[PDB]
Amino acid sequence: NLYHIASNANYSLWVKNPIPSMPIAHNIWDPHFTNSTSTPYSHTIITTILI
């Protein structure tokens, strides 16, 4: 848990504005998703994340 918060997460940004922000559990790497468009779990071209 500590690693995934360190690497695949946004603790450095959530700590600044915790009330409206949302933490990240870890990235999503699943080849079954759409290789096109953008999943509802990612900010367009950015990687996929879980709260």
Binding site: N10, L13, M22, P23, P40, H43, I46, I49
Partner: protein, 79 residues
Amino acid sequence: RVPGGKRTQELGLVIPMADEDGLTDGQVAGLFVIALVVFISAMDLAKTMYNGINPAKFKTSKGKGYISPLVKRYIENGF
């Protein structure tokens, strides 16, 4: 991100993402070295637990065993 749930949309809750990397590849490799150490030690421990204690070691193994001086005291202090 396409939010779901009433509260996220009606409060504007957002999930910030760092534009940096988080951990560099060197740090991940440093963690993976110790993870591999844990892995090797855990495989060894699994082997030892699977095979269990060998009582017949006193017939073949060298040495003569040892009971630590506190273990003797704990033996004779009671139970």
